[PDB]
Each structure stands twice: as structure tokens, then as C-alpha cells.
Amino acid sequence: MTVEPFRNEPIETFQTEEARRAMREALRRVREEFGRHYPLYIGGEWVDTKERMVSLNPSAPSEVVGTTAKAGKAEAEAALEAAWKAFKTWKDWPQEDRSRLLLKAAALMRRRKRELEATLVYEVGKNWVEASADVAEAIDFIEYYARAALRYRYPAVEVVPYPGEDNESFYVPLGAGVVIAPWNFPVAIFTGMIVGPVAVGNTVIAKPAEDAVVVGAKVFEIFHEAGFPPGVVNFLPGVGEEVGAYLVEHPRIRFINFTGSLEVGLKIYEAAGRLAPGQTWFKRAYVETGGKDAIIVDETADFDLAAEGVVVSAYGFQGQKCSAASRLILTQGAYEPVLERVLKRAERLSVGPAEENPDLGPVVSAEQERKVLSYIEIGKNEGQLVLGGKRLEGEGYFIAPTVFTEVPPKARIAQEEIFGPVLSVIRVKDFAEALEVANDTPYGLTGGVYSRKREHLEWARREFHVGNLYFNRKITGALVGVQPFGGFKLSGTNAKTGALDYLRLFLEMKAVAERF
Amino acid sequence: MTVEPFRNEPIETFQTEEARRAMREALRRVREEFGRHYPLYIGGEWVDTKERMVSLNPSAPSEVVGTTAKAGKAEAEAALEAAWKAFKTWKDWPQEDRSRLLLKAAALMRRRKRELEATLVYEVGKNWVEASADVAEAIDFIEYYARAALRYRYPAVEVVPYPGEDNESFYVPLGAGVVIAPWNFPVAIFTGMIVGPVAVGNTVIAKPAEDAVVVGAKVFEIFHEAGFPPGVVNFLPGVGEEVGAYLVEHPRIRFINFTGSLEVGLKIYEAAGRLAPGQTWFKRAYVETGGKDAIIVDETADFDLAAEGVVVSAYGFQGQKCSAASRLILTQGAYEPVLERVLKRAERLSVGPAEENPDLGPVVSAEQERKVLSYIEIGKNEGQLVLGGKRLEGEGYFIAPTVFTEVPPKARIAQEEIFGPVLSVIRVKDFAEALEVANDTPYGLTGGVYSRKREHLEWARREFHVGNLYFNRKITGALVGVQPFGGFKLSGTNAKTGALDYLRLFLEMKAVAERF
């Protein structure tokens, strides 16, 4: 099969009248559809349940965006049976055929992009450009993995010949697995974690995050329209520690693909290490588990450029990114000029209902609001509050952009992932100390350096121990294909999404010799 | 760096007078050195302990073949410190430099091949050709991984470019890990498991199997002479449940490379899944465990060819191979002709002291003898004993080639890894049933089919679910480079040794972007 070389889906900025008109219409239609109910999707059909899940609008939580069915153990069993039955034949599809199926799904998603963006705006409180980036990344995962999968096609392995024999090594998919996805990129990461394994012949049971079940269902509408065979992809909205734990622990689950909190990731990795009664394989678990990401700025930097990138990195999607700048490490000569600029920019940020396209919408839920506000209280006793540190007025979960300064490197707010609009500023002597402080956390996901000094940049390239490092630009928004995404240390297992290597994780190799 | 294309080291057949003379010379030198004591090797020096380990001749177990030091927790800690200290600089060596170091080690090993083979003969009871194949494979691992490592050199990752930026993705080693090695290939697998991770910048603490501590020490003499920097490779002979468990569970062990029994592999994988107090990463564990490997023969086969391959596969190195044919699955039409030929060939096999190059030497230890004889007792209740099934005269652990017939596919002797010269013969209706029986074990390592029917061969290529499948030849003796080695299901994690993919297991990826 021959398609155009991969390119990233452009991210809409809504600067033209045409784009604004399309987005206003999409928002209007999604809003007019509030209260819709979406069933489970199991074995190629929509399947309803007695119990349900409620999805609220975080900008106005009296408003129900939608409801879904609720999967328990019985539905999980049913999905597992469907997924294994499907695997038996799906694994035998030529790669070209599976890859074409992905490309169709990508085309369908692209045609529904404004609707999906609008759904993100209402369901998880993304502003317009954050929503567009999320949908664009989902499209990119499908386009990229469709093409990448062909690189593994029968028989792909380079082996050494032997006289009188054919030696043929090739990849095969693992089986049926479970995908457990986050609420913060519930189109992008949900899609990528599903279609990667599926592209190369696995089948998947997908468990969306509770806060993002409606948009998960719309992604499944796309899969269904694309025509994935029954059982190949299954949609099980439900409670993570219930249906999710049930599948993670199940002897017949082959692999687990997880993105979410470290707390949950640790439990999943531990459980995957155990042989459940009757289990006949060593489970694979891929866990991508957050960060405590720093931007370092030294006295050689463009301080205006640095301040802009820090503000985008810290406050984009309300800081609710595993990649968000939650630490700003300033050398002595950079401290005052950069902090002054960051404060000036940050105090001008707008906060309000996501539909209005503010700089920041609300945080995702009452529980998230509570956690973030709790960390702010902790912070008040660890560092100096210099901006924000309050919830704003309104029913929506609005939190002001917050900055603590003179934060000790070992402070809780300098070590633990807050996952909200809270930046901790740490003052250090020089670039060497900046690197020491940057590395001294349990995490290793993203990092940045603003500096004009070549030797500082190249030093950071070798020694700033994070999986995704950026110089003189924001540290969020890793592009599929361009920046393989994934971290070190307790940021997870280094499963690099949007990279050729990702698909290898969902394959095993067979070696077959015939002596003639 | 440019070297000759990889070729496998030729396995000596000892068909010439010079080869036999050279072997006799090496056997003499080795036995003259039976009194030797070999310390631990930690941080570039030989370090002795108060306690010791004794290595016996399994062909004459009242004869000591050497002693070694015995590592406990203190020595494990010392080695870990040395390994991390070394990692800090070893990781920074250019790949070409690390690869040249391996190539030197291979040249040194090649020049000592007869001595190593003779040590295998006396320490683990390999006959001459088994010993030569083992050392040759060790050389192959070093030559292969030296070359394969260059394929990962900075910056190896194919990424999509982005305007106004350099995007550079590259591999880095993980750190210090532990290698836990088996006694059955204590030069080949011991060497491969160490030099693969080391080639790409990791450092290693190696724990040889108790039964093969002397030959492991001789491999370290080679590493020492080659000039690995202090702390890069460390040698800790000691007890598996003691020093091995201690390292597996340690918060500062980065990865575990294990080859051995399923029982131990299960414990290791479970332990690797846990976050030890103060641990700051998700441990990687590669576990390659046993097999219950079958050869299927159908009525279209060359029955004489089949019988020869079955006898080689079942009884080479006394069946003490994870790849050994322990099941013979015969269709109705093949049963009588193949079984008669197998019995006629097997009844002619010599058993005796390994140095005399018998068809079979002894099993490796009193414990192995005890295990195999116990399974023989179990077998007498499950199937029909038709050949062997007895200990043979002498202090050496000689067990007769043994064949059970009319074995039910679910019998313990048809399911459990005996790891001795014991073949279970299973009668099936047709090829379809033969595949069902072949697949119905917890394991998935090696398998074979003898058949001239193309449709049967190609069906097995697709559906005989083992990592290493061979048609019309023996199922043992996977060659580095030619046949990527590793299994499915409870045969382990499918870490394919002697393959480009192996080295990827010991690397993580960093993505670094600079916006100009």
C-alpha cells in the first residue's frame, strides 16, 4: 500500500472567520446534544446496562454533558470473550488490510474534528486550541501507526543465512489486552493506546477515564463506522479500580497499556508481575505515569522568549499535563528578570468557561479541584506565594494561575505531581546546580532549557535526565513522529508513543527454519 | 569501525588427528589445574572470601574440579557500588570503543576454546561436540552483539522533522543490572547475557549457576585480560536464593537478565514488578524459562531422517536443554515406523564419563539425578516404559536414554520439564490433532515437524505456537544470528538472543528538540 509521507495534522488556531464559524456551529451542536446516552461497545454492537456513568461539564457542573452505560465484571468477561474470538482471525489479516482500516478511521475522525474538539471543550474543559491539539494528535497516532505497522510486516526480521536452509523470523501480535486511559487527553491518548496494538493484530478492551466517557464513546462511533470487525475494539466505561483492576488481574489478559497516575501505575505494574491462577504467559504492562517537569533558565537566555514558553508550559490546559512545567529553575542572574516577566504574563491570563476560549478553563472535577487547592495550602507553608493561590467565583472548577517562589528543591510542591495551574520557582546558583535540582526528583518525563550558551544546551542534552527535552521552546505538545514521547524513572516504562519502537512492544517474534 | 561480516564460529567435530590431539592436550591442562581456587571479580580485581564453593566432576563426583569464593550480601553491595560507579563513564564510551572491547574478548575466547571446552567436559559433563558448540556459541554472542550494537549508535532513531527545529532521538543504556545464568550453557548463555547489555553501555553483576562456577571464572579471566574497565563486569558465584534474590529485590538494581527454571523465573518476574523501598524506576526483567518441546512426525516424513533428528534432539547433552525434544508426537501412519527407528537408534547410544566423548555423559548433579529418576518413577505410572529408565553403574550420574510410550497428552511427564534423557511418545490421529497436542502445554519454546507435505509445514509455520520452530531437522542448537532464540507463554518473555532486537531491551530512548 502507498500513501503520502506522514505529516502532522495542523492544529487549528481559530484566527480565520471560517474556522471560528465552524467551531461556533460545532459547539452549538454539541451543547444541543447534552444529555445523550452512550452504551458499551462489545463484539461489534452497542450494549446497554442498568447502571450508568454521568459526565459533567467542569465549567458548569450542574450540566450533564452525557451519560454512558457502566461495565462491571460480567461485561468485562463478555468483552474478553469477544476480543479473543476476534483475535483468532484479526491476527491473520494482511498488514496492508489492517493499516487501511486505520487510515479509514483517521479520515472519519478528521471529518468529525470540530465536533470532537467541541466535545472536549464541554466534557473536560479544554479551551479551543487545546481541544484542537488533542484531536489533531489522535489523528496523527492513527496516521503514524498505520504506516509504522507496515515496517513490521511478514517477514520483517533481518537474520543470518545458513547453508541448505531457509531461516525466517517474523513478528506476531500478542493477543487480547486492556487499555486504561487518562481524562486529560481523552481523544489523543485514548486513541493512540488503542490503535497501536490493534494496528499490528492485537485486540483491545478500552477503559476510558470516568471524567471523559462521552468523548471516548464518540471515538468508538468512529471505530464502528470504519468497520473494525466485531471484538477487535471494545469500549468499557466503568470504575478504574473495579472493571480496570478486574482486567489487569485477569489470567486471560495478555497485555496492559496504561497511562495515568503513578499511584495506579505502580499497582498495575506489580499486578502484571504476578501469575494469576491458570495464566499461561508473562504479562506485558506498559505504564506511562506522569512527571515533575522543570524548565531551567540561565542568564544567557532570551528572557522574554523564556517567560512566554514557561507560561504556556505551566498553564496550558490548566497545568493538567504529564508534560506541564511545574518547576521553574532559575540561575541567580536569571532569577529576577525571568520571574518578573513570568508574573507579568501570568497575571494577564483569563480564566472562565472553556466554551468562551479563555486562557484557562476549569480543572476537570471537584476531586481535582480539591487536590489542587490542598497542594496550594501545603505550598503556602513551603514556599512564598506570589500569584494566585485561590479558586475563583462560580460553580465551575476555576483555579487562578498560581506561582510559589523560593521553593526548596525537596519541598512537597517541588517533588509531587499537583496536576493543576501551580508553578514552583526554585532559585539556584548556576547551571550545574540547575541540572542537579532538575534531576533530583523521582520522575523523568519532560524538561526544558532556555539558554543561548551552546555548552549548557549540549550538557543538558547529555545529563538532563528526562525522556523528552526541549531547548528554547515550550516543553508540552510533543508531536507524533517528531518527538517520541515517554519518560524515565517513575515517569513510567519508556514506551515511546508516536515512534516506530512503540509497535514492537505489542509483538513477539517467531523463528522458523526449514532444512531442505 | 569495519570488520568482516558476521559468520558463526565453526563447531569442531574432532574428525582430524590434530583436533583430537589438541583436545587431549587441553583435557590434560584442565585436570592438572583441578586444585585451583577462583575468587570473585569485583571492580576490576579478584576478591576472595572466607567461605567457598566446591565444583565437582559429574562423571566422577568424588573429584573436585575447582573451588571459588562465595558471595553474600556484603559482596553483592560492593559489586553494585562498583557497577554504578563504572556506569557513569562506561555509558559515555563511543559505541565503536565498546564494540572493539567485545571483539577483543571474542579473540581471546577463540584462542582459549579447547581449554574452555575441556572445562565444560569436566565441570558439567558435556561430551566433546556439545562442549565445542557451547564455546562456539559464546564467541558468536560476542561477535554478533559487538556488531549489532553499532546499529543503535548515536543518534539512531528515525524521526519526522519539524520546521525551525532539530529533533534528535537516541538510545542510552539503563544502568547496572544483574545476570543470573544457568548451568547447562555456562559459557554460551552466561557470556551472551552479560555482553549484550554491556555492549550498549550497561554494567553487570553476573551470578553463575552453582554447578558451573569454575568455567564462569575462566570466562572472567577473558574479560579481565580484554580490559573491561573496573566495575563494568563483576563475577559473584554464590547461592541463587541468597545473593541472587538479594540483587533481584534491590532498589538499585535497574534490570535483571535471567535464564533458568520456570519456578525461579516466576519469582523473579513477580519481584521485578514491585517497587522496593526508595526505588526510583520500573525494573525490567527478562526471563527465559523452560520448554516442553515436541517433534511432530507425520506419515509423509523421511522416517530415518526423523529418527536421527529426534535422537539428537532428545538426548543431546543428556536432554538437559530448554530446547530438548521431550515429546514425540506421531500420527497413526508414522507411529510404528518412527518409534521402531527411534528405539533402534537410542538403544545404541553410549553413556559414560564425558571426557571419553560418549553419546551421553552424566546428568549434572546428584539433585538432577534425583529429579530425573523421580520423573521416571512418575512415568512408569503414566505411560509404558520401553527403553532405559535406569541409573547406570558408577559414581558418575549416568542415566540411560529413556523412552515412554502411550503417554496421555495431559500426563505429568507430557507436561512438566524433566530436563533429562527422557522422551515421551504420544500417538495422535492426524496432523491437526498433532498440532493441538503440541500446543497444549504451558510452554512455547522449541518445536519441530518432520513431513514432506508442504501444507503441513506451512500450517505449522502459522499455528505450531513456539518461538523456535524447525522443519526436517533437529530442534536444538539455535545458531546466533541465524535463529533468534526465545519462546512464548511460560517459556519466558521472548527476549530473542542472537538477534538485533535483543540489545533494544537494554536501552531507553531520549528525544531532544532545539528550536533555533
Ligand SMILES: NC(=O)c1ccc[n+]([C@@H]2O[C@H](COP(=O)([O-])OP(=O)(O)OC[C@H]3O[C@@H](n4cnc5c(N)ncnc54)[C@H](O)[C@@H]3O)[C@@H](O)[C@H]2O)c1
Ligand atoms: N506519562 C504519560 O504519557 C501521561 C499522559 C497523560 C496523563 N498522565 C498522568 O495521568 C495522571 C492523571 O490522569 P488520571 O487522573 O486519569 O490518572 P488515574 O491513575 O487516576 O486514572 C487513569 C485511568 O486508570 C483507571 N484506574 C484508576 N484506578 C485503577 C486501578 N486500580 N486499576 C486499573 N485502572 C485504574 C481510571 O479509571 C482511568 O481510566 C497524572 O499523573 C499524569 O501524570 C501521564
Ligand SMILES: NC(=O)c1ccc[n+]([C@@H]2O[C@H](COP(=O)([O-])OP(=O)(O)OC[C@H]3O[C@@H](n4cnc5c(N)ncnc54)[C@H](O)[C@@H]3O)[C@@H](O)[C@H]2O)c1
Ligand atoms: N529459556 C532458555 O533460553 C533456557 C536456556 C537454558 C536453560 N534454561 C532453563 O534452565 C533450567 C535449568 O537450569 P537451572 O537449573 O540453572 O535453573 P535454576 O532456576 O534452577 O537456576 C538458574 C539460576 O538462577 C539462580 N537461582 C535459583 N533460585 C533463585 C532465586 N530464587 N532468585 C534468584 N536466582 C535464583 C541459580 O543459582 C542459577 O544461577 C531449565 O528450566 C531450562 O529450561 C532455559
Ligand code: NA
Ligand atoms: Na466530564
Ligand code: NA
Ligand atoms: Na560441576
